[PDB]
Design a protein around this ligand. Structure first.
Ligand code: CA
Ligand code: CA
Ligand code: CA
Ligand code: CA
Ligand code: CA
Ligand code: CA
Ligand code: CA
Ligand code: CL
Ligand code: K
Lengths: 236, 208
C-alpha cells in the first residue's frame, strides 16, 4: 500500500508554508508587471509531455495573465490603469490557479491574493478657485476670521492614509507683504485663519493671503502641494 | 508657545496588510503598534469598532496587539480594523486590512447521503453503478478530496479522484446478498490530513 502515492504529488505546492500565495504591488503598475515570479506548483504544465494542466478561475475583469510553463502571473492593464483611489477603488485582486493532475484527475485550487499599495499620485485640490472673508475693523486680535476650509469646502486629496491628509500654511505674499504678518494659521490641520495684528481701515482695506495646502507623504520629496488665495476685506 | 502636535503611526503594515494564521492561540500577540510624537508625549494605544473589538485587544502603554478570541477563516477570512493612538490631547486612528491565514482544520462532508444501490447479479465487470461526492472548505491540498474503500473490496473499486464506483468482479447472489462498504473521503494536506467515513450499501438482486 502507498507505493503509488508518487503520482498524487503533481499539483501540490513545491514549497512549505500556508496555502495562499500573497503578494503586493503598486497601483498604476505598467502592463506586464510580474505579480508572482513562480507559483511553485509541482509538475510541468505545457511542453510535449505535461504532467499538469494550469489555468485561472475567478479572474474578474481579467487583471491577471498566466504563463503556465514558467508558472508566472502578470498584470493585464493594456488600455486602463490599476487605480487604488476613487472612483476605481481596487485595493486587491484575488484569483484561483486551478491545477489538474493529468495522471490521476485530481484538482487542487491555489489561491493568489494581490494587495494593491497606494501611491501618492494625487495632489490636494481646492473646491473653489479662490476664497473670501469680510472682517470688521474692530475685530479683536486672536479672533478666528475665516473657517471656510471646514467639511470638504477646502482642499481634499483622494489618496489613502497620510498621502491623503492635508496641512495648510500661509506663505509670504511679495505683492502684499504684511498679509502673512496680519493673519496666521496656528492649527495647520484645520486651516482656520486668525487675526494676529490690529486692523486699521484708514491705512489698509484689503489683504491677499496666499495659502498653500500639502499632503503628508512619508518622503518629503514625494509630497504634493496646491496654492489658493484668501482675500480679506475690511468693513466699516 | 508650541501648539500640540498629534502623534502618528510608523508601522509599515498600514501600507500593505497584516497576516494572522487562523490557528493563532487566544492570548497570543499578533503585532505591536508603533507611533512617534514630536512633543515626546507618552502615548496610549487602542482598537476601535464593534467587531474588531471582539477579536483584538491592545495593551495601552506598549501597543502590543493580541488575540481576544479565536479566528476562523472559513467563517470570516478578513477584517478591516481601526487602531488608535492618543497623546492625551487628541486621538488619531488608522485602518489596516487583516488577512486570515488558512490551516487545514476541516474534514470532508459527504453529499446526498444516505448511500444505497440495488444492482442485479448479472451486472457486468467494468460497469459504473454509483457516484459518491464530498467537499471540504479548506484551501489548497487541504480542500482537495480523495475517495477510497476501507478496506478495498475484491468486487468493487472507487475512482480516487471522481468517486465513481464500479464492479470489478462477477457477482454471485447465493454467496453474498448484500455488501456494506466503508467509503473514506480524505483531504490531501501534507502534515495533518483529515478524513470522513460514509457507509455504502450495495444490494444484489437475484436472477437464475
Ligand atoms: Ca491612483
Ligand atoms: Ca493613490
Ligand atoms: Ca496625495
Ligand atoms: Ca503631542
Ligand atoms: Ca477554520
Ligand atoms: Ca481552514
Ligand atoms: Ca480539509
Ligand atoms: Cl448515483
Ligand atoms: K483622503
Amino acid at each position: 500500500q502507498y507505493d503509488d502515492d508518487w503520482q498524487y504529488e503533481d499539483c501540490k505546492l513545491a514549497r512549505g508554508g500556508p496555502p495562499a500565495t500573497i503578494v503586493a504591488i503598486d497601483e498604476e503598475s505598467r502592463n506586464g508587471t510580474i505579480l508572482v515570479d513562480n507559483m511553485l506548483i509541482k509538475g510541468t504544465a505545457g511542453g510535449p509531455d505535461p504532467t499538469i494542466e494550469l489555468s485561472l478561475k475567478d479572474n474578474v475583469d481579467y487583471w491577471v495573465l498566466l504563463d503556465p510553463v514558467k508558472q508566472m502571473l502578470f498584470l493585464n492593464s493594456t488600455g486602463r490603469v490599476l487605480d487604488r483611489d476613487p472612483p476605481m477603488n481596487i485595493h486587491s485582486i484575488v484569483v484561483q490557479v486551478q491545477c489538474v493532475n493529468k495522471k490521476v484527475g485530481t484538482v487542487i485550487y491555489h489561491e493568489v491574493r494581490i494587495v494593491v499599495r497606494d501611491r501618492n499620485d494625487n495632489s490636494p485640490t481646492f473646491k473653489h478657485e479662490s476664497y473670501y472673508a469680510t472682517v470688521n475693523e474692530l475685530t479683536p486680535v486672536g479672533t478666528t476670521i475665516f473657517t471656510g476650509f471646514s467639511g470638504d469646502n477646502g482642499a481634499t486629496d483622494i489618496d489613502d492614509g497620510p498621502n491623503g491628509q492635508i496641512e495648510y500654511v500661509i506663505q509670504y505674499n511679495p505683492e502684499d507683504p504684511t498679509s502673512n504678518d496680519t493673519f496666521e494659521i496656528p492649527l495647520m490641520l484645520t486651516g482656520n485663519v486668525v487675526l494676529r495684528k490690529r486692523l486699521n481701515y484708514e491705512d489698509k482695506t484689503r489683504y491677499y493671503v496666499i495659502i498653500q495646502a500639502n499632503d503628508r507623504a512619508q518622503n518629503l520629496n514625494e509630497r504634493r502641494t496646491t496654492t489658493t488665495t484668501l482675500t480679506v476685506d475690511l468693513e466699516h | 508657545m508650541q501648539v500640540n502636535r498629534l502623534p502618528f503611526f510608523t508601522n509599515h503594515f498600514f501600507d500593505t496588510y497584516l497576516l494572522i494564521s487562523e490557528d493563532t492561540p487566544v492570548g497570543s500577540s499578533v503585532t505591536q503598534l508603533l507611533a512617534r510624537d514630536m512633543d515626546n508625549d507618552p502615548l496610549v494605544f487602542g482598537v476601535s469598532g464593534e467587531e474588531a473589538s471582539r477579536f483584538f485587544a491592545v495593551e495601552p502603554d506598549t501597543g502590543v496587539v493580541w488575540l481576544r478570541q479565536p479566528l476562523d477563516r472559513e467563517t470570516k477570512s478578513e477584517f478591516t480594523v481601526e487602531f488608535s493612538v492618543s497623546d492625551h490631547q487628541g486621538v488619531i486612528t488608522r485602518k489596516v486590512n487583516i488577512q486570515v491565514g488558512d490551516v487545514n482544520d476541516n474534514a470532508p462532508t459527504f453529499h446526498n447521503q444516505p448511500y444505497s444501490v440495488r444492482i442485479p447479479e448479472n451486472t457486468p465487470v467494468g460497469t459504473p453503478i454509483f457516484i459518491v461526492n464530498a467537499t471540504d472548505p479548506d484551501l489548497g491540498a487541504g480542500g482537495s478530496v480523495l475517495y477510497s474503500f476501507q478496506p478495498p473490496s475484491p468486487f468493487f473499486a472507487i475512482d480516487s479522484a471522481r468517486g465513481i464506483v464500479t464492479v470489478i468482479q462477477e457477482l454471485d447472489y447465493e454467496v453474498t446478498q448484500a455488501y456494506q462498504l466503508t467509503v473514506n473521503a480524505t483531504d490531501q494536506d501534507k502534515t495533518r490530513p483529515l478524513s470522513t467515513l460514509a457507509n455504502l450499501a450495495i444490494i444484489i438482486t437475484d436472477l437464475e
